[PDB]
Amino acid sequence: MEFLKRSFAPLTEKQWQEIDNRAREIFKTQLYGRKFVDVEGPYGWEYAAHPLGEVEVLSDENEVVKWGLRKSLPLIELRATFTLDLWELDNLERGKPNVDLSSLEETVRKVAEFEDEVIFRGCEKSGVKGLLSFEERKIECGSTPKDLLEAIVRALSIFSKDGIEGPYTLVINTDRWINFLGGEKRVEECLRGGKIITTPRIEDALVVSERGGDFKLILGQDLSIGYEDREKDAVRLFITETFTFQVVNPEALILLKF
Amino acid sequence: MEFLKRSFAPLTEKQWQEIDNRAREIFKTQLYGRKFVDVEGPYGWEYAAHPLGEVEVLSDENEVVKWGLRKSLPLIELRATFTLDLWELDNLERGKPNVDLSSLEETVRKVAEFEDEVIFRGCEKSGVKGLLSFEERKIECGSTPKDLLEAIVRALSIFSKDGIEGPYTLVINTDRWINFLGGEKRVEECLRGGKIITTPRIEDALVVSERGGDFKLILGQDLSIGYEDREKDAVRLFITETFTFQVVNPEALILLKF
Amino acid sequence: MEFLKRSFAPLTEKQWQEIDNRAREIFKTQLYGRKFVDVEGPYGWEYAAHPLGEVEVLSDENEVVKWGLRKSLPLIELRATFTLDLWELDNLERGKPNVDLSSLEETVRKVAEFEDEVIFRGCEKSGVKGLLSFEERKIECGSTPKDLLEAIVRALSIFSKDGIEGPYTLVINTDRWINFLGGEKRVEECLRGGKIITTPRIEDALVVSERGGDFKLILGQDLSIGYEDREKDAVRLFITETFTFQVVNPEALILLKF
Ligand SMILES: Cc1cc2nc3c(=O)[nH]c(=O)nc-3n(C[C@H](O)[C@H](O)[C@H](O)CO)c2cc1C
Ligand SMILES: Cc1cc2nc3c(=O)[nH]c(=O)nc-3n(C[C@H](O)[C@H](O)[C@H](O)CO)c2cc1C
Ligand SMILES: Cc1cc2nc3c(=O)[nH]c(=O)nc-3n(C[C@H](O)[C@H](O)[C@H](O)CO)c2cc1C
Secondary structure, three states: OOOOOHHHOOOOHHHHHHHHHHHHHHHHHHOOHHHOOEEEOOOOOOOOEEEEEEEEEOOOOOOOOOOEEEEEEEOEEEEEEEEEEHHHHHHHHHOOOOOOOHHHHHHHHHHHHHHHHHHHHOEOOOOEOOHHHOOOOEEEOOOOHHHHHHHHHHHHHHHHHHOOOOOEEEEEEHHHHHHHOOOHHHHHHHOOOOEEEEEOOOOOEEEEEOOOOOEEEEEEEEEEEEEEEEOOOEEEEEEEEEEEEEEOOHHHEEEEEO | OOOOOHHHOOOOHHHHHHHHHHHHHHHHHHOOHHHOOEEEOOOOOOOOEEEEEEEEEOOOOOOOOEEEEEEEEEOEEEEEEEEEEHHHHHHHHHOOOOOOOHHHHHHHHHHHHHHHHHHHHOEOOOOEOOHHHOOOOEEEOOOOHHHHHHHHHHHHHHHHHHOOOOOEEEEEEHHHHHHHOOOHHHHHHHOOOOEEEEEOOOOOEEEEEOOOOOEEEEEEEEEEEEEEEEOOOEEEEEEEEEEEEEEOOHHHEEEEEO | OOOOOHHHOOOOHHHHHHHHHHHHHHHHHHOOHHHOOEEEOOOOOOOOEEEEEEEEEOOOOOOOOEEEEEEEEEOEEEEEEEEEEHHHHHHHHHOOOOOOOHHHHHHHHHHHHHHHHHHHHOEOOOOEOOHHHOOOOEEEOOOOHHHHHHHHHHHHHHHHHHOOOOOEEEEEEHHHHHHHOOOHHHHHHHOOOOEEEEEOOOOOEEEEEOOOOOEEEEEEEEEEEEEEEEOOOEEEEEEEEEEEEEEOOHHHEEEEEO
């Protein structure tokens, strides 16, 4: 909102709209975890920690008054800067329909990669545990389409034993999916009309349940673009966000090793 | 309109309608680029240039007043003539339902070939750059249906990385499509219910996005038929048009080499 | 409009009004061609070329499909910068009625000189042909008031033979008019109550007709003042415009040589 000093940048509304549209287009396809995790609505720019519902006891055994500290997850704030050229942006008012925005595109891709890295592999300094850390939810698979179908059937059996019943989704590496091409319809049938999501963020596959409420992404402020300063031929802008992540029910996740 | 001297030709309304219907039928199937590019509506017979939104600076460094010229694309005007025989046309009033129009058909085919040549391979004297000139948007493919499916999957991955997400279309040579016959349904599935367009204008394939606004055909006057003169047994007519073409976003185009 | 980043300059409305009024006052007296040419209303900041209504043919003689390019005049864009001092401008709010604006005045004079140079002597890189280039519309004159009156009578005879009949205007050099002082009323009578315009842009005289539609100045954006940047004690502003010029009917112009 107002903390993004957007009205102090030497840009018109058309130029701001151009920048926003390009960034939104790239984020929509490059944010992969949001395709299957839950998003807990924005809390605001002042939100700092998310409760864990637990107390850690710090007093001795014999004290009359006993006390401890409540536990929480601190939010992560990120900021990434880039520069844009003013003459090239001003050609848009002369009527050019294809203005150069390569710096914006590269920075957007790096920010998306950072967020997906946190979701899939966690952050030790922050206390986040990623999806690929739950090593006890792992089964072995072969390298043939028959093996993939058998693995999916076994995974559904394990879900049934645990009591998890919703739509099911397969998340798989692109290079591995290329070898399994030709069985897409059969894979969908064995998943009971579920989704397949190909991604370069992982090396193997995994199967998840999308009934709702098992993986949470907590947002304070969603991804935003703001203004820093101006340096003699160009404007410096930044992308900012604040978030954290947690896995509530590990039983809704199975790793495939192959 | 009135600049086509149509009311001065010795023809009746029925004969004019016959000629127009035949030409329209042939154009509708032989104009291939219009099957997947955008058409920017007619501007009129007086339109001359299309702006590029850019200035070229022509003054020295030390001048107090600095100046340059705006840049634009000039439109191309084409005219092709043919002759028709008056007695054979007059049999239509006696009641003949199949009058000979072979000269009209041949001229229509040549005009369509000219326009498609400009769209696919450009015009150096005019400043148009064709689709097959963007050589950096190229990936390699094999000569088996499995290879075609793999190439299409990789192309969709590249589109996803660039942020381009719309319906996808495959444009392929007819002789090459004959070898890939038998996998049409599978190709459609890998394209996510996209279109296939076979054409003899290219030697390989290409994949495009049809979200809208990436390839523009600018028309001043659409294809029209008019009257020139009369020579002793026949009427001389002509086909005319004025147009230009530009590729706005090269990221919505991938060339397949095989 | 908004492409002039005026709202980002550290100036108040009173200071902007002061600057605008001074510039307008100087332009109104120093733009000489606008005193007798027609002005074709503003088309906008995106206008790039003006049609000439002509085709240049570029194909061979034997081709079935023949083609060419439409012709036009590209517009000229000019920008000139100057600096103003912030403390001296801020005295205006303390109540000073005579603030120093000498840089603005000098830049305005140079811009007006540039535009008049284009109107009177053309621009070869742009394709503009100036008034003094039409050398076939020339008659000889002496250096006495009787000679001037005789020359004007002969010029009106030539206009009558060509069919041009409107109000007539004499455009003459100031130093030469000083020698012809004393016959102003007689010159007006021989012109039939026409105007006299003295100017330092030419060395001899010329006579024109002001019936309308013979000399055209095409404007995209009229003369405007905008903001560039700020450098530590001062603001950098600029004057910008985009225009072109053409002589439609050379028969409404006669050059006097003396
Ligand atoms: C004809 C012309 C047009 C220009 N237009 C722009 C413009 O739209 N935006 C811009 O930032 N600079 C523009 N410049 C350059 C601008 O003056 C630049 O910031 C200079 O370095 C300032 O002294 C233009 C320069 C010329 C000669
Ligand atoms: C019975 C008959 C019918 C004709 N009908 C036509 C006709 O409908 N249209 C035409 O152009 N010429 C027609 N012609 C030929 C026409 O007279 C031709 O232009 C002659 O060469 C003119 O002297 C016809 C000739 C004959 C004998
Ligand atoms: C009494 C006083 C009044 C001033 N007023 C102005 C002013 O109205 N505008 C201005 O630009 N500078 C003004 N200055 C100078 C201003 O502080 C200058 O930019 C300094 O160099 C900033 O450190 C003023 C200085 C003094 C001592």
